Structure 1
């Protein structure tokens, strides 16, 4: 290890918090807790929903929760299916009137999360890492953007000797706070080991 989180390092500027709200030592303890339960669950029943981030606003006993996804319709439900379920599931989980507003992801090829959850899913589909890692991710360069650094952990392909891979385009100056980058992880528990992946998309400068 020898790298600072390209996201948290910027959590101050050019990067909003995926959970903005106030709280005091009292409830704060169980507060961030519920947020985890709800957030962890919203993925379980919406994995293939192609969900990106998941913000969580909190005014007063009424969390908002915004499920950003490239596939909104599927996260919507049969004109009330999905929404109702989730919006209701947030019952005792937070013991408060929790809403839920979906956000459409523009260009699902420039968002880290997706580009990460995807490549990993392809790997689980018995596919050559190099191919997808390169091409199936190279797209982020065709819909725009200036630079995208990918990274696949070890154990790739039949081999006991874990190895990391490079492959990067444009420029990803993660040494610039005013740079703003879309970083996110993604695992892939396969027949053996847990081939990981890290997406570094440089979406413009300042």
Structure 2
């Protein structure tokens, strides 16, 4: 059957929201639309910067966007010129001055989004899908993860009939709500259509609850 979203089911348990602001019912819709526009613009602009998480906050009449990236140099620039630009377009998209903060990811192989993007980029270059999945799983397991599951769906290898394949090493306890599961979905566009990639990474259970997550 169908499976619940691993982050959605944990959003109030051991996971934080990617948006952290307050708004009254009148401003809520406008704020949400501008936040979604910001996310779309950032995702389009920073494809090659290995960007995983975007966190949007509205402290008081201002905006603060924290970008988690594995290549802070490309995001920042040679003298920090590009952060000034990013602030300029983000202030244009929103209606308040925006500050851009950078968060370096020191373990790119434990981030589900980056692994999915790597697999999708490899599939877009006609790399064998079994080899790509095995390489990704091996690298993630070597980086210290407790388990990883990778699934690819579509016209695999150009075949006319679409089918789903998946590969897993370790433990992925999806039914446990206190397990730290990172989940990502990414599509690869090939000349024969679209191949979907899903990645689950398990990093151990989280004890102490949301109170210890420090919400």
Identify the TM-score tier after normalising by the shorter chain: over 0.9
Following superposition, the deviation at residue 91 of structure 1 comes to: 2.0
Residue equivalent to 1:50: 50
CA distance in 2, matches of 1:138, 1:199: 13
Please report the TM-score for the alignment, with normalisation by the length of structure 2: 0.93
SS at match of 1:101: strand
Q: Which has the higher helix share?
A: 2
Aligned partners of 2:158 and 2:192 also within 8 Å: no
CA distance in 2, matches of 1:95, 1:23: 15
CA distance in 1, matches of 2:74, 2:103: 12
State the 4+ residue runs in structure 1 displaced beyond 2 angstroms.
Answer: none
CA distance in 1, matches of 2:80, 2:108: 24
* RMSD, aligned CA: 1.0
Aligned partners of 2:56 and 2:63 also within 8 Å: yes
How far does the alpha carbon of each residue in 1:8-66 deviate from its partner, in whole angstroms, 9 at most, with x for none?
10001211111111111111111111111111111222110000110001112211101
Aligned partners of 1:115 and 1:137 also within 8 Å: no
CA distance in 2, matches of 1:9, 1:75: 32
Residue equivalent to 2:27: 27
> Which residues of structure 2 form unaligned runs of 5+?
207-215
Aligned length: 206
Greater mean deviation of Cα atoms: 74-83 or 140-149: 74-83
SS at match of 2:154: coil
Q: Which has the higher strand share?
A: 2
Residue equivalent to 2:3: 3
Residue equivalent to 1:165: 165
> Which residues of structure 1 form unaligned runs of 5+?
none
CA distance in 1, matches of 2:148, 2:13: 21
CA distance in 2, matches of 1:138, 1:195: 21
Following superposition, the deviation at residue 177 of structure 1 comes to: 0.2
SS at match of 1:127: coil
SS at match of 1:68: strand
Residue equivalent to 2:183: 183
Does 2:132 match 1:127?
Answer: no
Following superposition, the deviation at residue 2 of structure 1 comes to: 1.2
SS at match of 1:34: helix
Does 2:20 match 1:14?
Answer: no
Residue equivalent to 2:209: none
Residue equivalent to 2:91: 91
